[PDB]
């Protein structure tokens, strides 16, 4: 079991960190018993939270909330879709789909129990 309240970077890591490609079924599993529903679509991106982090240093962009705290990846990166074909929660399925992508996230200062880097990725802004 998750604990109860993950920081955001936490979430970001569970939620989009997996190096080598899984079961998009498996995978998804636990982040559905957190939220306690199918979510319906969910990018996993496969590089190490270190390498994702990284990314964090890079020259600051708009995020798609207009905001400026989001940073691309300087390379594109290995990543699955899974999309939601069939069941209902608990019971839910999924198809993969391999990308080789840019990424986009949103990067905030660490909170007291994040890693202590400068910054600390937290959302999935887009894939391009």
């Known amino acids: ?9 936490h979430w970001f890591e569970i939620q989009h960190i997996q190096p080598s490609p899984l079961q998009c079924n498996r ?5 559905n018993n957190y939220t306690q529903h199918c979510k319906h679509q969910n990018t996993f991106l496969h590089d190490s939270f270190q390498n994702v982090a990284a ?43 391999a ?5 986009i996230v949103a990067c905030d200062p660490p909170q007291k129990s994040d890693p202590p880097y400068k910054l600390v990725p937290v959302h999935l802004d887009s894939i391009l």
């Open 1 to 9: 079991m998750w604990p109860k309240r993950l920081t955001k970077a």
């Open 27 to 31: 995978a998804m599993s636990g982040i």
């Open 55 to 97: 990314v964090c240093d890079l020259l600051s962009i708009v995020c798609k909330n207009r905001r400026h705290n989001c940073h691309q990846s300087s390379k594109p990166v290995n990543m699955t879709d899974c999309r939601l074909t069939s069941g209902k929660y608990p019971q839910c399925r999924y198809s993969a789909a």
């Open 99 to 103: 990308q080789y992508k840019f990424f």
